[PDB]
Design a protein around this ligand. Structure first.
Ligand code: HEC
Ligand code: HEC
Ligand code: HEC
Ligand code: HEC
Ligand code: CA
Ligand code: CA
Ligand code: NA
Lengths: 125, 376, 355, 125, 376, 354
């Protein structure tokens, strides 16, 4: 509710902006437009590019690396608009930046932003 | 109790703990069913528009389709495909206009056909479901042309090409009855039967004048194609019913949706898709509320249900929200889809009791048109 | 049993009596001092290894045996994508089936048959004792049982802590025993954000307990023929290494040109690189990937030769979806990737960590 | 803000949806996107076509024929959205129908809707 | 006190009564003056986008411009033209990508140029004003490209054609200084200088590394092109000022936007266009609030105004609204513009007292970028 | 003065002694019984009128005098568009300047000069009394004063209620005295929502007080030559009627082919139509507008000839912005317009309708 308050992760609702894996998500939660937590809605294209954040998981007290990926080729869904910035560095550190439309490598050269997925790729170290 | 976002978090947690690996990919929208619903968003005349694909059972958006300027959605009844006639311009809302028809695969949502319409022929209007229409076989699509004169464009979806323009009298809307035949509504107060061969003038046959000059029939009549039933309300609540299954128009008894004391106390139909019609149940659903005669497009808080044959009111539901458009699934124990343009929410109700079960919010900017499939 | 079987493999691994002229052992081509690879020079340099006759050369680079015990047996998952196995073309199911093939191959250890191997084993009193304790009496009198026992011993030796100790810097850093250098950490970050992760991580998502930096899949990254090695192999100018397709029972022409995604552990010390040892430098291996992404002319040039990389030996089935990321690795990111990959060196090869 | 209540005209604010001349307006008032009551915003195109409504002026108590005219060639303004329907008839009676994008006769064949002007053409009858 | 809507109603009534005639026509926008402000609406990544042209004095929308996917708006300081680098697709958000640059007449709002950028070269990103920049003479538009590597595309507005792509190092942003020169900011902590002709490897020179690698320079620096002043805040409100007026980067004494006590109480800059610079007054304006370190893109409610020479705080305005972006008109007695992306409202403030003077609401869907001419 | 001045104009209007052979008066070509237009038939029908000598025919159709007094003097407004004047090409500034030209036109009244007209006025003692009461004695001894006074009196006479009574059904409907028939109201609505209103309304917006269904502008709607009337005029087939450009002083080549927008009052009873009198029927003049909007083949055909409308006499300068409305009038609306235009017929000429 308080936009400026420290981000409080939770592992009990992914369509919520405070879901632990969305700790550096920008745009829209794919789950809310026909995708899932780690998959793209139909018709869109899965970008091969990604950015990372270390998100704390309060279920197991371990921080995990979320290599976010965009689903592209569609107008923005307009459902579950979210903007979090845990460990989010500026554009010049692109691998931690999230204003970028990370749609690169997407099939059929799709570069419009629809939504973003939050898959784990490792642990914090 | 548990929302679809909560159950997802629990699945992801177990997958992590268990160490289940899994390949990120493009989901397939689940198989199309009667409970799937499409909510178009004309976006208050925006140059681009969004159609949401929604699973009415789960109350979940299973996919989306992007559209152009006031595109006309058409969902094939058998759920084999969906399509719209849409209008893009070369520079957002300016420059060279390209009217095109796009067919989509109903699970991948990929365009399976992209057909250009010559000479920007689409009639542009606040979205009216039956200004663009599929023939029963879904091979042909028809769309209305108001300019330079009332006419109807023929598009071959199988051959994936436009055919030709059928010029016609001063008539409006399109209700296909066959692979070469469709009805329209004219100014004189008659309907027009329009049979179109391979080429030439179509075989234009007017019906009798079936309503007065001073009787006003709404822009959103319900039309079941498999029933051949045209449900056409008037401003006052009166409803015209036309059976087009025979190949010609039989005019059914003029049914009254509102009582004499209700119309006296200011009750009237108002909204966008003011009327829905269940094929199997043969029930008419109508948005109504206490309003002045010239507030006929505003939202309504009630929905009266009446038997299409007899006209007996079966129930009146307090919707609990400002509803602009209504529609129904054509399966048994159907859902009453209630679309608030203001709330941008598809309130999904039980059509038996009118109780709100769930709601899909954030459906665009000004969602107006609900479209179901008649699969069963 | 498990302790002693590996002990017999250890014996066999270094025993040159499993070669025809008695000049060659596993250790020869898979040297424990070089991450179980061949330090020897041939006509194609270190690209391909020389057999027991001292003349015959392979057509492929001798890979490490380290962490080869982590690779699932060859299989095909529901995606229709093959995984696991042994050999660059995965023609061996697993370490046990693999082990026999060097011994019999005329261009390698060149023992005429399984009988000749068994006759060598009998002549050692140590084996008669050791083999007969694990596999029972008479095991050495039966060529099929003797050959296969030796193989399993060799597989068992390869599964021991010795071959997969996980004492690389990466491993220590993933425990918090020590930290990455900033360059390594950037290298790590790039590795897990760029297309590398798509092919050189055990998993698509989640975490791996014993990561060896390969999805064990088969891809054609579009490598040219290594002409020097191809010439020494003597297979000819018209020969095309079809990779996975050359595995028996793989007919799918979409697998032509595809090779097992190698483990990147000890990669710093196991050059030259790729199946045909075509790149001497670890850096060239990384730069090769820029040919699918970079607009710049330089990206089409192999830095080691100054000439174009070359026409892919097999021009079809390239993993363009993965390879054409639309993002070119600058030299900074390459430097970082090199640094990260150097951290995958096993502890006892950190001394060997050169160039 | 009772939408269904009888429409009460006023002659004190053209930007409000209850302005007497907006009695059958559909879309957006041009005075909010750079137009005015009877002119188009810059860069849009004025349709020659129109639709009419006899709007009651509460000031002099005289009704007036308001031939509404769309400004075209732009995406919808998104400002001052008004949908009034005093006298609005269905599409088959187009002269009094306002869901129609009345953009015909506009320069450069502009047909996209931006906003609508509310000029008098006479006294009603 | 009397609103612009009420005046026009009163005026119109007088004309009717006096019997005055007036031909309905396409209005021209008023002449571009110093208090014109452009609110651009990236619309949370919408395929199409609006730019509002606002008179800050009246608080009136005097015109608009439709744009594509995440366009980069630019306003010629001299007020002679505006432009943007837009992106459109043949099928709304799908299909053939056409990146292109439109120059518009600032009073008719008519496009005077449409220039195709070949190979869809634009960097698609949440709108950073300085990822696309006019050169001081308004003859060349420079735009950033991230894929397949950092590059900078050159567009000739005079001859109306795209020139070339400039290969650059791992650097970001574009702050044009000369007609053939611009600076970027590099990963290694340096600024790169880039001199470019019509052909040749551009002359690329790096400054010294001017900040720790753990000190994070925000994505929305304020660049006053006519002053050559690059005002770059860090996450902590420490502000790097780089002077580029000599054609070369000379670094200024760093200033802290916040006191040490405020930084212990958790005050930090936050928002979108977090910082604004008034040229004539040499004042830095910064959106600040009490926030966690990683809530740096959230809106702020306070604007600290500090002297750019001394670092001395001049005012701490309580804006009374959730402000995401600030900017100033460069006229004297300047307006302080406060764009609430949440409220979709431009709050027009007296930049002296911080009093909200007036406001222009309904400025799209997620308006983020404020742009003003530097005309004086 | 102006009461009696009109009475003297009334004398002169019906006086055929203002023509060489004493054969024709204003009333001849502008017959009060026929909405002040010519019932007579020359070589090209009623398209053009025959002169005093019973031989010479004009090139243009004789217009109503009714409601011409409401047309403001010829001028150019701030838009750049010309407005007002008299004659189909606006070649007369006002009624006064107009009145003289028929008297002196060889192919009309054919008086050789102003002196000859003065001589005729002295033949009547009625004139010497009436003229000298308004313009003083000796007025008829001076050709220039007499001719001018006669023109002025004729002008004044045409500015009386008898020429512009505003007693049409339209007028009574707008006063609340009676209602339109549904079809007439439909016609009016069509008339004020379709391109008709762009040219045939006094104003762009607001309420006109004395509407005469012309904006007094000049437009070229792209009309063809009148074959038969053109031969009859004897001006040759190579001759081109450039409309407004033919006005002295007008040099702008954009005005070539443009004619004054005629008041549609009494239009129902003043056939044939347009400047050259090419369309016998009113319906035909309406359907002509559809050649710019209709995709249909019949729109290309003139229903009276059954043959293509014909190439415009002047191809350039067409008012295409207004004419190409993207909307075709169907017969239903063409009916509606015919009905609405009939309501613009004056009381005394109502009987003529049929
Ligand atoms: C040189 C003559 C060799 C001797 C002697 C041995 N090996 Fe080898 N090995 C060699 C090459 C050139 C290759 C790659 C061949 C290919 O077709 O891909 C191999 C491969 C293996 C593998 C597969 C490893 C992997 O694919 O990751 C294993 C497990 C292996 N070799 C083990 C091994 C053992 C146990 C040996 C003694 C019996 C042995 N090799 C001998 C070259 C040579
Ligand atoms: C699948 C599409 C891949 C992506 C993406 C990357 N790599 Fe790769 N790599 C892959 C295969 C199938 C192979 C073997 C190819 C062959 O036929 O020889 C490789 C090889 C390497 C090597 C050499 C290892 C060795 O020779 O023992 C290195 C060092 C390597 N790969 C690194 C690497 C990096 C840093 C990547 C991202 C830039 C990368 N690879 C992408 C398959 C794929
Ligand atoms: C300006 C572009 C015009 C529009 C739109 C319409 N009319 Fe018109 N009309 C116009 C001119 C300049 C003239 C004079 C003809 C000429 O010789 O050039 C006309 C003529 C008529 C007439 C003839 C009546 C007569 O007195 O001879 C009629 C009956 C008429 N016009 C009717 C009419 C209708 C119904 C329209 C809308 C469909 C219409 N006009 C449009 C200029 C313009
Ligand atoms: C017969 C031949 C005559 C006679 C004897 C008069 N007129 Fe009239 N007139 C005639 C024609 C064919 C035309 C159209 C000519 C053209 O436009 O080139 C006219 C025109 C007028 C007009 C202009 C009206 C308008 O454009 O709306 C007026 C005001 C007019 N004529 C008046 C008039 C008077 C007062 C006459 C007796 C002095 C008179 N005319 C004689 C044909 C004929
Ligand atoms: Ca190697
Ligand atoms: Ca006439
Ligand atoms: Na400087």
């Amino acid at each position: 509710t308080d936009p400026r308050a420290k981000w409080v992760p939770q592992d009990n609702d992914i369509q919520a902006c405070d879901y632990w894996r969305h700790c550096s998500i920008d745009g829209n939660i794919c789950d809310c437009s026909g995708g899932s937590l780690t998959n793209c809605p139909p018709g869109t294209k899965l970008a091969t590019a990604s950015w990372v954040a270390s998100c704390y998981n309060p279920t197991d007290g371990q921080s995990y690396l979320i290599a976010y990926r965009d689903c592209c080729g569609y107008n923005v869904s307009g459902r579950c608009p979210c903007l979090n910035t845990e460990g989010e560095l500026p554009v010049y550190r692109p691998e931690f930046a999230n204003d970028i439309i990370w749609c690169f490598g997407a099939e059929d050269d799709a570069m419009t932003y629809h939504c973003t997925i939050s898959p784990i790729v490792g642990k914090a170290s | 109790q548990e929302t679809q976002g909560q159950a997802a978090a629990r699945a992801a947690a177990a997958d992590l703990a268990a160490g289940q690996d899994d390949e990120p990919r493009i989901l397939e929208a689940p198989a199309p069913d009667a409970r799937r619903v499409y909510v178009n968003d004309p976006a208050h005349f925006a140059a681009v528009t969004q159609q949401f694909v929604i699973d009415g059972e789960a109350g979940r958006v299973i996919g989306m389709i992007d559209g152009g300027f006031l595109p006309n959605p058409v969902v094939a009844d058998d759920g084999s495909f969906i399509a719209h006639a849409s209008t893009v311009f070369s520079r957002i809302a300016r420059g060279e206009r390209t009217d095109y028809v796009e067919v989509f695969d109903p699970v991948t949502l990929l365009p399976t056909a992209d057909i250009e319409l010559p000479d920007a022929p689409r009639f542009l209007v606040g979205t009216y479901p039956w200004m663009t229409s599929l023939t029963p076989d879904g091979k042909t699509l028809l769309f209305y042309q108001f300019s330079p004169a009332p006419a109807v464009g023929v598009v071959d979806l199988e051959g994936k090409a436009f055919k030709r323009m059928l010029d016609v009298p001063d008539c409006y809307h399109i209700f296909p009855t066959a692979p070469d035949t469709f009805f329209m509504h004219c100014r004189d107060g008659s309907l027009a039967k329009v049979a179109f061969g391979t080429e030439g003038t179509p075989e234009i046959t007017h019906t009798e004048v079936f309503h007065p000059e001073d009787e006003f029939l709404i822009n959103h009549p319900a039309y079941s194609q498999k029933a051949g039933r045209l449900v056409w309300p008037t401003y006052t609540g009166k409803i015209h019913q036309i059976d087009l299954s025979s190949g010609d128009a039989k005019f059914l008894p003029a049914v009254e949706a509102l009582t004499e004391a209700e119309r006296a106390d200011g009750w009237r139909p108002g909204g966008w898709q003011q009327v829905a019609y269940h094929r199997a149940l043969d029930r008419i659903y109508l948005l109504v509320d206490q309003r002045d005669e010239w507030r006929h497009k505003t939202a309504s808080r009630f929905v009266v249900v009446l038997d299409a044959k007899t006209g007996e009111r079966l129930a009146k539901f307090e919707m609990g929200h400002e509803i602009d458009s209504i529609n129904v699934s054509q399966d048994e124990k159907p859902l009453l889809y209630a679309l608030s343009t203001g709330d941008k929410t598809l309130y999904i109700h039980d059509a038996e009791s009118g109780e709100e079960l769930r709601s899909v919010n954030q459906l665009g900017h000004g969602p107006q048109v609900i479209t179901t499939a008649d699969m069963g | 049993a498990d302790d002693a079987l590996a002990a017999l493999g250890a014996q066999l691994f270094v025993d040159p009596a499993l070669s025809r002229n008695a000049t060659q052992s596993c250790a020869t081509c898979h040297d424990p001092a070089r991450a179980f690879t061949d330090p020897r020079e041939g006509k194609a340099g270190l690209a391909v290894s020389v057999g027991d006759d001292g003349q015959s050369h392979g057509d492929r680079n001798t890979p490490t045996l380290g962490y080869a015990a982590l690779v699932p047996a060859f299989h095909r998952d529901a995606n229709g994508k093959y995984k696991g196995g042994q050999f660059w073309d995965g023609r061996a199911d697993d370490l046990k089936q693999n082990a026999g093939q060097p011994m019999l191959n005329p261009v390698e250890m060149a023992m005429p048959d399984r009988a000749a191997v068994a006759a060598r084993l009998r002549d050692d009193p140590a084996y008669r004792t050791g083999f007969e304790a694990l596999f029972g009496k008479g095991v050495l009198d039966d060529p099929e049982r003797a050959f296969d026992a030796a193989a399993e011993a060799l597989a068992a030796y390869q599964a021991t802590g010795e071959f997969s100790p996980f004492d690389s810097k990466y491993d220590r850093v993933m425990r918090g025993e020590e930290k990455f250098t900033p360059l390594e950490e950037f290298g790590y970050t790039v590795f897990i954000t760029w297309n590398c992760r798509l092919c050189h991580m055990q998993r698509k998502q989640g975490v791996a307990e014993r990561e060896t930096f390969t999805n064990f899949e088969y891809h054609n990254i579009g490598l040219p023929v290594n002409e020097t090695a191809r010439e020494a192999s003597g297979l000819g100018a018209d020969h095309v290494d079809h990779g996975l397709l050359a595995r028996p029972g793989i007919e799918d022409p979409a697998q032509s040109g595809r090779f097992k995604v190698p483990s990147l552990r000890n990669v710093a010390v196991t050059g030259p690189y790729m199946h045909n040892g075509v790149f001497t430098d670890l850096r060239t291996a990384i730069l090769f990937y820029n040919k699918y992404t970079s607009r710049r002319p330089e990206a089409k040039i192999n830095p080691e030769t100054g000439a174009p990389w070359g026409e892919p030996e097999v021009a079809r089935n390239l993993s363009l979806a993965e390879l054409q990321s639309g993002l070119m690795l600058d030299d900074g990111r390459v430097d970082a990737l090199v640094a990260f990959l150097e951290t995958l060196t096993d502890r006892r090869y950190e001394p060997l960590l050169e160039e």
